[PDB]
Amino acid sequence: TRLKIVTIHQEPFVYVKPTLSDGTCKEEFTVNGDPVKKVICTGPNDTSPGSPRHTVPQCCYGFCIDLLIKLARTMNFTYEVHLVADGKFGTQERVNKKEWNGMMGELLSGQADMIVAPLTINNERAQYIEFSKPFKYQGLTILVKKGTRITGINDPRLRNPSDKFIYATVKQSSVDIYFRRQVELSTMYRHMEKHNYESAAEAIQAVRDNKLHAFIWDSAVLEFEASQKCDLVTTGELFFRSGFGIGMRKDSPWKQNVSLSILKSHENGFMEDLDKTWVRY
Amino acid sequence: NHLSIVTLEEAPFVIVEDIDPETCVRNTVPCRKFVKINNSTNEGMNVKKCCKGFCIDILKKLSRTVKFTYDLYLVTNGKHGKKVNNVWNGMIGEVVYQRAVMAVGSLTINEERSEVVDFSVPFVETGISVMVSRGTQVTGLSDKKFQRPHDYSPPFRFGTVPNGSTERNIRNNYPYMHQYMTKFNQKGVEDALVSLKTGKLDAFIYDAAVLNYKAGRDEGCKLVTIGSGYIFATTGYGIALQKGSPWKRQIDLALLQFVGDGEMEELETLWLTGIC
Ligand SMILES: CCN(Cc1cc(=O)n2c3c(sc2n1)CCC3)c1ccc(F)cc1
Ligand SMILES: N[C@@H](CCC(=O)O)C(=O)O
Structure with missing residues (x-):
């Protein structure tokens, strides 16, 4: 046992x-x-x-x-x-x-x-x-490089995207599930499925390296990351709330x-x- | 699938109203309350009343999705739930002793209740918050004013509404604070808020979801929760079901579906937003 x-x-x-x-x-x-x-x-x-x-x-x-x-x-x-x-x-x-x-x-x-x-x-x-x-x-939030201007989940750069402002999440995650299910977020989902990362660490690094403009992920992880890496900031509050079990x-x-x-x-x-x-x- | 369901009045989660001149209209559902004829008899009448509120809208959504009908009634033997001489009263007791298939309301999930009933996934976050007049300097429940109250002249005056999950937590964690507080027991939230507003109380320790709602609706935004709405001993409100209930699986999945599709956020906007 x-x-x-x-x-x-x-x-x-x-x-x-x-x-x-x-x-x-x-x-x-x-x-x-x-x-x-x-x-x-x-x-x-x-x-x-x-x-x-x-x-x-x-x-x-x-x-x-x-x-x-x-x-x-x-x-x-x-x-x-x-x-x-x-x-x-x-x-x-x-x-x-x-x-x-x-x-x-x-x-x-x-x-x-x-x-x-x-x-x-x-x-x-x-x-x-x-x-x-x-x-x-906790919930979902957005990580950006300090100086990037995003209002939050309703920012036009997110809701009406182009190849000029790249945002993503982690592949085969709960965030991927959330955006795939919610039809109201389908425009965001289609943009993300082109740029999703294998892991949160790779996504965080890409934001630092100016390869990714915004990373959509767990607030308990992103706020910890922002508090350590002062070149990174979270934008806004939580657009969705969820728990870990x-x-x-x-x-x-x-x-x-x-x-x-x-x-x-x-x-x-x-x-x-x-x-x-x-x-x- | 016609289920006996128990509730308890606690605005804005469950709000009780008198029936029309003679059914329940608008966003209300029928709910009955057993009322005694007198104190020298066990005789009483079920009085037809109308219920509404955040938890009632959740019940209406669950009834439709999970496909059950119900007979909603107001608990008359105690309130939320307390084990007295090893016997559960209140909403918990109704479920434990099989008078209700489920209990819906501002019912806090805690370890001792979970040993005797099964709870659904939480639909609202709660725990313990501290309500004070704006500006009162307290670091939390660990503040010396609460932990060692007689170390202050005059001592800090604080209380809770007894017999619920808050008093149980205080009794378990802070024995001295607990025995000190009992002289400041409040009959209910409304009495406690009047005691705070008139300077007869310095702090009111109670259910976080209720306190955060009350602080948000306070006239003059005078009464606030410490640490910008800090929640101690975080838990949540859950639907209590009988251990091994066949309804738990579908209720849990429906609640998670409501959270996921935005239905829960819509209910919070409708019932729980405040100006403060
Ligand atoms: C971790 C603290 N917590 C609060 C909490 C946790 C949590 O996932 N959710 C969720 C709700 S409302 C809520 N409140 C809507 C979406 C998911 C808790 C801990 C122990 C419990 F038995 C119940 C709750
Ligand atoms: N919601 C609490 C009642 C209020 C409290 O004691 O804070 C419970 O289920 O016992």
């Missing part, structure tokens, strides 16, 4: 770093002087799409790793962490047959028993998996106790402390 946990690289929720030469993780401390809890997470090294993937042990830490450690202690389970083989969160695509990719596919195929990541709760995924009660409430198969025997532990952590200040440690500052 050793749980296979799947995660994804996504600062500040999941930091991914190489192990030291001896295969251990570098000893680090917060501003509070408390040791940083780290876990060994196996995963492929960064490679282009359609290439062989070579799996190696890596170091994982962050909000979601601290949360996993607390759940494992409370519910008394052991685990092994791995990074999603295709590097994606997960969407359902047509192959008559339909298949889930990313962490969604891994959980549904039994490659993982639990998704512990900044995984958006939405109708499309809830039809197939069980989400816990949310551990974080733990993902499990519908027949999981841990489902009720995962949600009770999450509720206990919201009520006793534990989740607020994690938020202050990782997501704020």
